[PDB]
Amino acid sequence: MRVLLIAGGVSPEHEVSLLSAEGVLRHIPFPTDLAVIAQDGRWLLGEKALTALEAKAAPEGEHPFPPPLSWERYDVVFPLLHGRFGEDGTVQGFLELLGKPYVGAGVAASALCMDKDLSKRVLAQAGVPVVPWVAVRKGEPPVVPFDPPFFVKPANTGVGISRVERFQDLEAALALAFRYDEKAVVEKALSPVRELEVGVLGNVFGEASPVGEVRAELLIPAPLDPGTQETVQELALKAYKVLGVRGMARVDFFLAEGELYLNELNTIPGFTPTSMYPRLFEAGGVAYPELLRRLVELALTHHH
Amino acid sequence: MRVLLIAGGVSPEHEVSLLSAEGVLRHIPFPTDLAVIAQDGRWLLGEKALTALEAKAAPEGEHPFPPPLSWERYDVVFPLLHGRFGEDGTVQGFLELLGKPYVGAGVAASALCMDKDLSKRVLAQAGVPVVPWVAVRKGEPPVVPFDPPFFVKPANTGSSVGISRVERFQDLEAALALAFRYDEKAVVEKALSPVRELEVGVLGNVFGEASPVGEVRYEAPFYDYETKYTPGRAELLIPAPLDPGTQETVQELALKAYKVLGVRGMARVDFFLAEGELYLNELNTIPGFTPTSMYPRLFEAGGVAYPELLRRLVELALTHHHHH
Numbered sequence A: 001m002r003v004l005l006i007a008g009g010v011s012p013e014h015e016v017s018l019l020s021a022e023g024v025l026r027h028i029p030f031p032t033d034l035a036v037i038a039q040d041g042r043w044l045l046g047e048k049a050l051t052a053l054e055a056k057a058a059p060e061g062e063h064p065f066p067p068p069l070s071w072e073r074y075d076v077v078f079p080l081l082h083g084r085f086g087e088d089g090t091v092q093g094f095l096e097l098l099g100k101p102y103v104g105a106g107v108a109a110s111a112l113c114m115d116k117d118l119s120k121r122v123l124a125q126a127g128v129p130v131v132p133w134v135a136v137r138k139g140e141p142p143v144v145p146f147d148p149p150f151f152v153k154p155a156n157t158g159v160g161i162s163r164v165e166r167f168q169d170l171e172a173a174l175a176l177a178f179r180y181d182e183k184a185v186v187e188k189a190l191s192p193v194r195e196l197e198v199g200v201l202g203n204v205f206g207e208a209s210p211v212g213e214v215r216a217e218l219l220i221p222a223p224l225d226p227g228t229q230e231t232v233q234e235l236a237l238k239a240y241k242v243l244g245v246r247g248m249a250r251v252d253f254f255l256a257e258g259e260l261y262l263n264e265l266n267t268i269p270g271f272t273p274t275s276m277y278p279r280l281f282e283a284g285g286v287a288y289p290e291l292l293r294r295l296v297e298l299a300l301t302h303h304h
Numbered sequence B: 001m002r003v004l005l006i007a008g009g010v011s012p013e014h015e016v017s018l019l020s021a022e023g024v025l026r027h028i029p030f031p032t033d034l035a036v037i038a039q040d041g042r043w044l045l046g047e048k049a050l051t052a053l054e055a056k057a058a059p060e061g062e063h064p065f066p067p068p069l070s071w072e073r074y075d076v077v078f079p080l081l082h083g084r085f086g087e088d089g090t091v092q093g094f095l096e097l098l099g100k101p102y103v104g105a106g107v108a109a110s111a112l113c114m115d116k117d118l119s120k121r122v123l124a125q126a127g128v129p130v131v132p133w134v135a136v137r138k139g140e141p142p143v144v145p146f147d148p149p150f151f152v153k154p155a156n157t158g159s160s161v162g163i164s165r166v167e168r169f170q171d172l173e174a175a176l177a178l179a180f181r182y183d184e185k186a187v188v189e190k191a192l193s194p195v196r197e198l199e200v201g202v203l204g205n206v207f208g209e210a211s212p213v214g215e216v217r218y219e220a221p222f223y224d225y226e227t228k229y230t231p232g233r234a235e236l237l238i239p240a241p242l243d244p245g246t247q248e249t250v251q252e253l254a255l256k257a258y259k260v261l262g263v264r265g266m267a268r269v270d271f272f273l274a275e276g277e278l279y280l281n282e283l284n285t286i287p288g289f290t291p292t293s294m295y296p297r298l299f300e301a302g303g304v305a306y307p308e309l310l311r312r313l314v315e316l317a318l319t320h321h322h323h324h
């Protein structure tokens, strides 16, 4: 079985995407070719991709989309792209039309988990705790029922984020966010707050890894009481199932005043050997080569 | 200025899509080329695409995806595909990576509006009244929180394909198996009867304008496939016979759901009216443009002639891409 690895991308996470590709290529137990999307959207195949990998940045590519890629020569595609044109369902839709099995969530789950507003609406309706938030659309004035501090983020970008401490500064933060997305979210900023992260693996019905914490060091496992550790994993699996995520997801939480809040589901998390998602499943008995093998196997299982 | 019209698809609504292409091609006020996705997934271009149209069905195609199209010839793509692979964000995602302006909703809104489970979760959270429902996975034991009669559907479907009305729990397993033939996730809704079916068209990007409210009448048990497209079988009341407050409320809820889901271009929003209570049934981001179709007739009743509706759909696509 041969695997195609697509990395880079036009998003600001182009570099960290290439760093994830280097770690995967160094440990995947399959023959794996690399294909790079340069920052200008054009593709690099063959040796120019590896050259772009070693340079850690591909500013300009060769082939405009769609690329002259021998799709039939690969059994599984691993979209290792972060952010826009990576985790938002566009590349997934292309692969769906190519008929190629691919790692990770499908079009609907990728687009939903990328939308900071619509994902919370789904999660809140399912009974999953999330931080109080409001959507603001460009032009329409904002209606914020809570008090500062807020976070003002572009809803679909995954840059333009501001921590607003005075209501006076809200119009400036919305103006900054609106130049990257027509819809913005305003989230109540919790403080003090701890960040917890847990990995899920599987198709719709996943298994949870141990919980980790970001304090920038990675506490693995996170120093959590037995009850809180369980609720984090339970809440992650529920959210994973409600959104219909496939393959994998890193589910980030907030812990404040003893309350858990689902922060974000990442369908293509950072994947260096030292990244949180591989380290969490390593702590759970799933080593990095085995983790990559299972992700490929799950891509084929869904494809029947 | 040149529009590429894409019709057909590998969804069950393939033949419905070719009918809509004929209606759009007849009145579109732009130079428009047709491309057809045959039922095997392979594309027909140029003269073969037009021949596939007169056949009213395209079983086999020539070019595998992606097709050898000169995308730089076309300023706007009009995906006139219904259902899976066309209305659910997959084709939209391809057009996004191509950098080409296209008519209709984006990736997220298309995928969300094609999922009868997730869409209702968003609408119910935003306070939009919906029918009580439950989702069921393939091979997962069904737990129906209410009592029959039911409507069992695949979560991703169109033109009433795979939908069953259930009156006994013994008939539920057979209704779910029929639904699982078209989707791995099913929905089980509480059947409303008697029910009136109200439909209203929306036009615009996120902040839309509503058409007059129309109504669907028929003698069949429900608005099924044969009723929807066999001419004369379903009768369209345009505008619908309603109180002023009722037509107003339908339009307000249509625009509200349209805005929450971030729909672009167009949508036909369908409602249930039962015992004085309204219920939003579903949103359709690529509605029909065929002779028995409600969307263009509603805007025609509202003063927007068929060529003008298609002109604004194309211009809205250009506005979003180049200016947002």
Ligand SMILES: Nc1ncnc2c1ncn2[C@@H]1O[C@H](COP(=O)(O)OP(=O)(O)O)[C@@H](O)[C@H]1O
Binding pocket: B116, B131, B151, B153, B157, B158, B159, B160, B161, B163, B189, B190, B191, B192, B193, B195, B197, B222, B223, B224, B270, B272, B281, B282
């Ligand atoms: N809860 C319900 N109560 C009454 N009729 C229903 C209900 N759900 C579906 N129907 C009937 O089934 C038809 C199609 O349902 P819908 O959810 O729109 O599926 P599709 O998207 O395939 O059209 C509707 O026109 C309606 O007549």
Ligand SMILES: [K+]
Binding pocket: B113, B114, B115, B282, B283, B284, B285
């Ligand atoms: K729909």
Ligand SMILES: [Mg+2]
Binding pocket: B157, B158, B159, B282, B283, B284
């Ligand atoms: Mg439908």
